[PDB]
Enzyme design. Structure first.
Site, PDB file in Angstrom:
ATOM      1  N   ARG A  55      52.818  29.267 -28.085  1.00  0.00           N
ATOM      2  CA  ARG A  55      51.961  28.594 -29.067  1.00  0.00           C
ATOM      3  C   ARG A  55      52.011  27.109 -28.686  1.00  0.00           C
ATOM      4  O   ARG A  55      53.040  26.517 -28.801  1.00  0.00           O
ATOM      5  CB  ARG A  55      52.468  28.828 -30.513  1.00  0.00           C
ATOM      6  CG  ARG A  55      51.564  28.296 -31.621  1.00  0.00           C
ATOM      7  CD  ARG A  55      51.853  28.919 -33.026  1.00  0.00           C
ATOM      8  NE  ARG A  55      50.770  28.668 -33.991  1.00  0.00           N
ATOM      9  CZ  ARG A  55      50.856  27.804 -35.007  1.00  0.00           C
ATOM     10  NH1 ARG A  55      52.002  27.174 -35.177  1.00  0.00           N
ATOM     11  NH2 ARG A  55      49.825  27.582 -35.853  1.00  0.00           N
ATOM     12  N   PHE A  60      50.198  18.161 -31.451  1.00  0.00           N
ATOM     13  CA  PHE A  60      51.160  18.657 -32.424  1.00  0.00           C
ATOM     14  C   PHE A  60      52.517  19.074 -31.768  1.00  0.00           C
ATOM     15  O   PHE A  60      53.550  18.408 -31.965  1.00  0.00           O
ATOM     16  CB  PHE A  60      50.523  19.802 -33.253  1.00  0.00           C
ATOM     17  CG  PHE A  60      51.435  20.412 -34.337  1.00  0.00           C
ATOM     18  CD1 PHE A  60      52.612  19.746 -34.803  1.00  0.00           C
ATOM     19  CD2 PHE A  60      51.094  21.681 -34.890  1.00  0.00           C
ATOM     20  CE1 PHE A  60      53.444  20.320 -35.804  1.00  0.00           C
ATOM     21  CE2 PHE A  60      51.928  22.280 -35.937  1.00  0.00           C
ATOM     22  CZ  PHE A  60      53.080  21.617 -36.358  1.00  0.00           C
ATOM     23  N   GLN A  63      55.647  25.290 -28.521  1.00  0.00           N
ATOM     24  CA  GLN A  63      56.653  26.181 -29.046  1.00  0.00           C
ATOM     25  C   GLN A  63      56.977  27.316 -28.057  1.00  0.00           C
ATOM     26  O   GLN A  63      56.082  27.907 -27.471  1.00  0.00           O
ATOM     27  CB  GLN A  63      56.259  26.752 -30.434  1.00  0.00           C
ATOM     28  CG  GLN A  63      57.453  27.506 -31.108  1.00  0.00           C
ATOM     29  CD  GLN A  63      57.104  28.036 -32.507  1.00  0.00           C
ATOM     30  OE1 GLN A  63      56.201  27.511 -33.145  1.00  0.00           O
ATOM     31  NE2 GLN A  63      57.815  29.095 -32.977  1.00  0.00           N
ATOM     32  N   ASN A 102      61.807  27.949 -37.229  1.00  0.00           N
ATOM     33  CA  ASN A 102      62.509  28.825 -38.197  1.00  0.00           C
ATOM     34  C   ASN A 102      61.498  29.447 -39.150  1.00  0.00           C
ATOM     35  O   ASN A 102      60.332  29.085 -39.101  1.00  0.00           O
ATOM     36  CB  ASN A 102      63.644  28.048 -38.975  1.00  0.00           C
ATOM     37  CG  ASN A 102      63.103  26.948 -39.872  1.00  0.00           C
ATOM     38  OD1 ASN A 102      62.183  27.168 -40.670  1.00  0.00           O
ATOM     39  ND2 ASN A 102      63.652  25.750 -39.726  1.00  0.00           N
ATOM     40  N   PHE A 113      60.746  24.043 -30.547  1.00  0.00           N
ATOM     41  CA  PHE A 113      59.478  23.409 -30.173  1.00  0.00           C
ATOM     42  C   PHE A 113      59.699  21.973 -29.648  1.00  0.00           C
ATOM     43  O   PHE A 113      60.676  21.314 -30.002  1.00  0.00           O
ATOM     44  CB  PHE A 113      58.459  23.394 -31.330  1.00  0.00           C
ATOM     45  CG  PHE A 113      58.957  22.762 -32.593  1.00  0.00           C
ATOM     46  CD1 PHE A 113      59.778  23.495 -33.492  1.00  0.00           C
ATOM     47  CD2 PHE A 113      58.582  21.440 -32.928  1.00  0.00           C
ATOM     48  CE1 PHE A 113      60.251  22.912 -34.671  1.00  0.00           C
ATOM     49  CE2 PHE A 113      59.048  20.861 -34.149  1.00  0.00           C
ATOM     50  CZ  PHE A 113      59.892  21.601 -35.002  1.00  0.00           C
ATOM     51  N   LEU A 122      58.254  17.741 -41.237  1.00  0.00           N
ATOM     52  CA  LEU A 122      59.295  18.684 -40.788  1.00  0.00           C
ATOM     53  C   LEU A 122      60.731  18.148 -41.001  1.00  0.00           C
ATOM     54  O   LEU A 122      61.688  18.889 -40.860  1.00  0.00           O
ATOM     55  CB  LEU A 122      59.083  19.085 -39.326  1.00  0.00           C
ATOM     56  CG  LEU A 122      57.708  19.646 -38.956  1.00  0.00           C
ATOM     57  CD1 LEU A 122      57.689  20.136 -37.504  1.00  0.00           C
ATOM     58  CD2 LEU A 122      57.366  20.814 -39.887  1.00  0.00           C
ATOM     59  N   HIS A 126      63.590  21.334 -40.368  1.00  0.00           N
ATOM     60  CA  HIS A 126      63.796  21.811 -39.032  1.00  0.00           C
ATOM     61  C   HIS A 126      64.881  20.940 -38.408  1.00  0.00           C
ATOM     62  O   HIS A 126      64.818  19.693 -38.525  1.00  0.00           O
ATOM     63  CB  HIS A 126      62.481  21.760 -38.196  1.00  0.00           C
ATOM     64  CG  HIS A 126      61.469  22.792 -38.657  1.00  0.00           C
ATOM     65  ND1 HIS A 126      61.415  24.068 -38.151  1.00  0.00           N
ATOM     66  CD2 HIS A 126      60.530  22.734 -39.634  1.00  0.00           C
ATOM     67  CE1 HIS A 126      60.483  24.764 -38.787  1.00  0.00           C
ATOM     68  NE2 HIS A 126      59.919  23.976 -39.692  1.00  0.00           N
TER      69      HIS A 126
HETATM   70  N1  LIG Z   1      57.307  27.585 -38.663  1.00  0.00           N
HETATM   71  C1  LIG Z   1      57.928  26.946 -37.604  1.00  0.00           C
HETATM   72  O1  LIG Z   1      58.976  27.270 -37.030  1.00  0.00           O
HETATM   73  C2  LIG Z   1      57.331  25.629 -37.163  1.00  0.00           C
HETATM   74  C3  LIG Z   1      57.559  25.273 -35.826  1.00  0.00           C
HETATM   75  C4  LIG Z   1      57.010  24.064 -35.407  1.00  0.00           C
HETATM   76  C5  LIG Z   1      56.301  23.288 -36.320  1.00  0.00           C
HETATM   77  C6  LIG Z   1      56.095  23.698 -37.643  1.00  0.00           C
HETATM   78  N2  LIG Z   1      56.625  24.823 -38.024  1.00  0.00           N
HETATM   79  N1  LIG Z   2      62.958  30.665 -34.958  1.00  0.00           N
HETATM   80  C1  LIG Z   2      62.927  31.967 -35.151  1.00  0.00           C
HETATM   81  O1  LIG Z   2      63.896  32.672 -34.846  1.00  0.00           O
HETATM   82  C2  LIG Z   2      61.618  32.521 -35.853  1.00  0.00           C
HETATM   83  C3  LIG Z   2      60.596  31.610 -36.230  1.00  0.00           C
HETATM   84  C4  LIG Z   2      59.440  32.095 -36.853  1.00  0.00           C
HETATM   85  C5  LIG Z   2      59.335  33.469 -37.092  1.00  0.00           C
HETATM   86  C6  LIG Z   2      60.362  34.339 -36.707  1.00  0.00           C
HETATM   87  N2  LIG Z   2      61.451  33.865 -36.100  1.00  0.00           N
END
Ligand SMILES: NC(=O)c1ccccn1
Ligand SMILES: NC(=O)c1ccccn1
Ligand SMILES: NC(=O)c1ccccn1
Length: 165
Positions: A55, A60, A63, A102, A113, A122, A126
């Site tokens: 992704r 932005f 990931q 996460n 990411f 974030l 995060h």
């Molecule tokens: N949902 C996520 O892990 C995520 C990852 C990067 C930026 C915003 N959200």
């Molecule tokens: N960071 C992870 O282990 C993860 C993030 C989003 C959805 C499922 N697993």
């Protein structure tokens, strides 16, 4: 000791692109840093080598780190399926920030990411644990293969990865 440095050798549809290196902030998030470090060397028997950046959203983030479902729904840490948010000392200040993906409080695994913009919303949700040291030009090249919905127009892979001296 000195904060560890890890490299990713990036490929685009199997073609070498370049190397991104990372400083891991073991001095502030030793647990989180150790996870990414060991996943990079593959020394527990699993990790990032051959996996992809599934992704990529220009302006932005990039990931990756899902080496079990290859799409954003998998991965695992060196501690078990999931580990706790260690702390939120470090903020998402701009491009090059390396941070844990996460799906809720205390659900870190292997997915991470690389920020290509400041993402302050974030902060405190995060865990930030590193930063790009060299090859931000390569991260910018990667990012050009992303799109608005995050689907990559070419396959972006970690052809090789390791720890540097
Ligand atoms: N949902 C996520 O892990 C995520 C990852 C990067 C930026 C915003 N959200
Ligand atoms: N960071 C992870 O282990 C993860 C993030 C989003 C959805 C499922 N697993
Ligand atoms: N939440 C914020 O601080 C923010 C700033 C810019 C774009 C989106 N969100």
């Amino acid at each position: 000791m000195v904060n560890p440095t890890v490299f990713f050798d990036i490929a685009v549809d199997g073609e070498p692109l370049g190397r991104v290196s990372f400083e891991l902030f073991a001095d502030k998030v030793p647990k989180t840093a150790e996870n990414f470090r060991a996943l990079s060397t593959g020394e527990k028997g699993f990790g990032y080598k051959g996996s992809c950046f599934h992704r990529i959203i220009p302006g932005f983030m990039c990931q990756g780190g899902d080496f079990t479902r290859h799409n954003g729904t998998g991965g695992k840490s060196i501690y078990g399926e999931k580990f706790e948010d260690e702390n939120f000392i470090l903020k998402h200040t701009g491009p090059g920030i390396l941070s844990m993906a996460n799906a809720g409080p205390n659900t870190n695994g292997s997915q991470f990411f690389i920020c290509t913009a400041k993402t302050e919303w974030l902060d405190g949700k995060h865990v930030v644990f590193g930063k790009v040291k060299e090859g931000m030009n390569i991260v910018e090249a990667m990012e050009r293969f992303g799109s608005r919905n995050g689907k990559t127009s070419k396959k972006i892979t970690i052809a090789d990865c390791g720890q540097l001296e």
